[model samples]
Target: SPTATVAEQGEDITSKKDRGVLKIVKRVGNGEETPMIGDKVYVHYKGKLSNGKKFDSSHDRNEPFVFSLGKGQVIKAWDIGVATMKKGEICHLLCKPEYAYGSAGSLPKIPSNATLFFEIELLDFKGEDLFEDGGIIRRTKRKGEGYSNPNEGATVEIHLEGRCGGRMFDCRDVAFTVGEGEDHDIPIGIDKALEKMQREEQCILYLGPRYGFGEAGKPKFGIEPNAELIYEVTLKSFEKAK
Candidate 1:
């Protein structure tokens, strides 16, 4: 049963003794959509000290925070706490210091070795069906004006940022003709995503090793062999080949 009342101290909810997080509020979600690792989750949260001092609130900012599960994009407590939640569900978490900032607490907002509390509400998530060929997942972020789609021979320009393991490897503006493999050396996965995009459209692509650098990853740019990749790309402009 879903309840809004806070749990009593020492009440056992979802206890992760190994990781040091205790659930205080539990609400059953009304949907069958559960997030998986690598999926991007949007959430609203409020953080506070054990003394009831409010430290942060996404609600105040009126913008949900976004992070990928199991990617270490956030604090360890969040990785463990939010993973068990479903979309639209709200939960409270009591975090042990080790699972939080530990001895080196965040200055001003948190004190050393202080336990933390958080109220989190799952909003939505993306990146579930984007995977293709076991390596690439392409999903549109924004649609472009007009119904015009690009063809293989189209000339396109894009603004893109490539990241792996939460580190940015490259960001640039690029121009190339689709399907002109040798001339542009564009990866097969990227070219395919481009074919589906229109001028001014934005998309997020997650690429596994096979669709990315393969066994020979780009080490010069800090990408390891067989590393997974993420690309946030926007089609700045495109024109059909004359």
Candidate 2:
């Protein structure tokens, strides 16, 4: 059953899970890594309703649309589905009304409660995406000395600043043996992110809830439940072990 594909309108699509609500399959394969949540993505897409009437196409205008993948600039279906796409890949997404326009559809083309169809081509994207599934994103503000990142257990020194919603929660210059930061009050996310840094590098990190404070948050510090976080850091020096 997995070998068989349903071909329609010159595209062969194989159905996967989340069938009734959202279905996706490859239109073509141009494989590589997927983009992260905060990275800017370039895509060309065509939109259509259930009856196969074309609503819009970026190809017609010769301009690709750009948006941050997880920033709510796109429909819910696209945010969910496009995050799974590789650069130069093309895929089709079948989105239910709930995942699309809901009851209040956009003007002229779509109706209330209308299901939608989309064909999307991923053009290009760029930025520091530390994880395959978008848990942590890094923007390197100051370049470091070399290409090598620090290994775990390496003794490190750094100036660190942590914030939530533009408010400073923690800021201090601290030094510690790496892999032992739990003793120094560094959160697990910050610890792991530091492992990826080179000496004298300054960068900002965008941490999802699972990578930052969890559902309970830090009540005494005024962090809300399931908070996303921002951290600005500078790596001063690190010494590796044998």
Candidate 3:
């Protein structure tokens, strides 16, 4: 069994072998809270077999892997273990088959029922769930300058790209009055996203139909009716209504 052999070098970690997942913290990070779903986490890792033979290493590439938490995008052990980590924290996770690739292993690299070891460092994470209901998703590409988010009626300027169907349909610098995009062809949804942004904040928004083209999509504009639209926007600046 995995519990019998794995993580024998580390001291007990408060029932660490619960359900065949072992967590050994190497460095206690600074933050107190763990990451939530929809938040993206960055980490560097080394994947090795029980015999210490290397299977993969993010360090070799000099680039960390990034993914959303608790999303089944990675192994089950990672979601459980990484959620327990803080920023800058380093930890080792020992995963049994149930929490890893299971009986059918990854061909050529991992074997079936292989007990795996992953050395992971939690670099940082971004809280990008603009609306918990999943209405609007935002990922900050380039952070904005200030903490100030604009209000309605403010004349905001932004460089935006309307993208879908494998390419961008519109890309230009434009200005619009918040809550008054009726004259500018700006979707009401995009404006709602703007008011939630900060100055010079460059972000990619996954805008839902409620905040996009609505039930009647604009196919001539290269958009399927009622489909979600992708908007890449930079909130350049805005002026408060006098």
> What C-alpha lDDT do the candidate models reach, one value each?
0.73, 0.75, 0.78
Return the TM-score for each candidate structure: 0.51, 0.49, 0.51
As for lDDT, the candidate ahead, 1 or 2, is: 2
User: Cα deviation of 119 in candidate 1 (Å)?
Assistant: 0.6
In the range 1-242, model 2's lDDT, one tens digit per residue, is 21123113223222343342444556654766677655688999988787778898888888999887765788877876777788888877777777788899989889998877778888887666677557777876665775787778888889989899789898899888777776776556777888878788888888888877777677767888778888888999888755
Task: Give the C-alpha miss distance for residue 29 in model 1, angstroms.
Answer: 1.5
18-105 per-residue lDDT for model 3 (tens digits): 5577777778899687776546899999888977788998888889899887668999888878878899998888888888999999
Worst lDDT 10-window in candidate 1: 1-10
Candidate 2: give the clashing pairs.
none
Note each model's CA RMSD in angstroms: 15.3, 16.0, 14.6
Model 3 deviation from the true structure expressed as Cα RMSD, one decimal place: 14.6
> Largest lDDT belongs to which candidate?
3
* C-alpha RMSD between model 2 and the true structure: 16.0
The residue pairs in collision within model 1 are 130-137, 135-208
Q: Where does model 2 exceed 4 Å of error?
A: 1-21, 128-242
Kindly provide the TM-score of model 1 when superposed on the true structure, using C-alpha atoms: 0.51
